[PDB]
């Protein structure tokens, strides 16, 4: 599948439902589709062809969501660039990624590198609305991860498996706060999961989301919010009551201590707390651990169990599966794998290796250590290095 | 030491039906659906074969 295909079901089912809320701007599902179609038409009219990469340099806004969807409708993959990156980093990402065109706003126009076509999203053009259509094997985005940043090339099929996963449990009444950089793959949960579920994406006001802005967002109707491990830890120790009123808070990335989760649960008994784990190479997250309302976290916070449609293996130095309670190398397989690393076939072939448990399939070597619990959860045991 | 990172290890290059290449430690049985096409050789030698011979990451199914 593809996220546009999943998105199309929600546009058909409830076209007048709210899809994106920006400060004074509210876009319904039908309105979002029409805007993306017009910008896609512009891209097709400029010579954009299937598989092309289009860079994106925008601040979070309704225009951002439209741009990513428009690139997909034109058959191309978006290369997200954070407007706050230094110019040499921006220049490197554009050049390494093979993007020949770059969508920007008036405010970001000066960040487009020289020699790269700038496409100003608020400019009109004559081209009719037209869409080539996303396809599951075509590329969906290239996200850079670091010494030097490398581009992880992710196909539509992997993005849709993540975004459409039933485990997210996002429903039409949900409202998800969007504040993560769209250059990072936490934005795939904040943008695409609600849109494939019928919910609304709520663009956070400019600046970092602090506890106060979180409380205010909750008062305005936000029901789910992802925070980086650092942000979750800060708010949990200083103002854990700020999560009150959320249906679910999510966190992951860097290490999260069990103590932080226990503090939140004590202040907010009804809040679901979800720990996410995974690399960009496996689309946002491959495993997760969910603390239900009223439940108390143990002394250790697991990275949890594989998402539906995924598999994990813990292998020793001989590539043999270990028994529970044995620390080994963590490998991720099943749904959500990237195609590989752009321009780096050797790196792809050493990180994305043959999977002995699935014929012809690959697994991603996380470089992390883990052990199984007796009942099939995973505990982090540090990086192999 | 993880076997896939050992620069002094002996390695194979494998290929699946989609044309994707994989490094593989030569001591381990080759999984089903994968064919050995190079090695045993040094890690760098195997990486060089891949860089030389894997010219399109795109799955061979995608191309046709």
Numbering used by the authors:
A (entry chain A): 9 to 154, 158 to 396
B (entry chain D): 2 to 65
Q: What text does the study give?
A:
In this work, we have sought to understand the evolutionary history of lipid II targeting glycopeptide antibiotics (GPAs), a vital class of nonribosomal peptides used in the clinic for the treatment of resistant bacterial infections and exemplified by vancomycin (Van) and teicoplanin (Tei). Since ANC1-3 domains display polydisperse elution profiles in size exclusion chromatography, we instead turned to the characterisation of an Acore construct of the Hpg accepting A1 domain from Tei biosynthesis (A1tei), which possesses a homologous pocket to ANC1. The MbtH-like domain Tcp13 also exhibits the anticipated fold, containing a 3-stranded antiparallel β-sheet and an α-helix adjoining the centre of the sheet.
These two key substitutions (H237Y and L295V) enabled binding of new substrates and potentiated the binding pocket for subsequent refinement and partition of substrate binding mode. Activity of ANC2int is consistent with this being an intermediate pocket, showing reduced activity that is improved through natural selection, and supports Van-type GPAs as being older than Pek-type GPAs. No substrate bound structure was obtained for A1ANC2 and ANC4, with substrates shown in stippled lines and greyed out to show an approximate position of bound substrate. The ability to interrogate the stepwise changes in the GPA NRPS via mutation of A1 provides important insights into their evolutionary process, showing that the switch from Hpg (ANC1) to Leu (ANC3) did not result in an intermediate pocket (ANC2) capable of activating both residues.
